[PDB]
Structure 1
Amino acid sequence: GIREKIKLVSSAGTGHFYTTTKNKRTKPEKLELKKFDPVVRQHVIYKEAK
């Protein structure tokens, strides 16, 4: 949507990534979240756009 998508990279050095629709139009402070990495099986931060 007009809220756009953000693509964040794994803090495990993997090429596999995470993508979400997180809206900034009311809440603009950056998304920087932990998720399960399916290539190393760890719980890591996904950070920094593109």
Structure 2
Amino acid sequence: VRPKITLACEVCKHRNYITKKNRRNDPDRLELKKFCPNCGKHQAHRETR
């Protein structure tokens, strides 16, 4: 019900963060704006599949 998801960058596709969502409340993918250490700037992160 609260699975562990990993968030990947939408430019270089590194998996930088792991977190938890709720699968019934957020059925779609999580888009956040986190800081990628590869790119050096805050960029759009999205779940994996």
**Under TM normalisation by the shorter chain, which class is it?**
0.5 to 0.7
Structure 1 Cα separation of the partners of residues 15 and 27 of structure 2: 25
How many pairs were matched up? Answer: 49
Q: Which runs of 4+ in 1 moved over 3 A?
A: 25-30
Structure 1 gap ranges (5+): none
* Identical columns (%): 39
Measured on the aligned residues, the alpha-carbon RMSD in Å equals: 2.1
Q: TM-score by structure 1 length?
A: 0.65
Which has more radius of gyration? 1
Where is the strand percentage greater, Structure 1 or Structure 2? 2
Q: TM-score by structure 2 length?
A: 0.65
Structure 2 Cα separation of the partners of residues 28 and 16 of structure 1: 20
Structure 2 gap ranges (5+): none
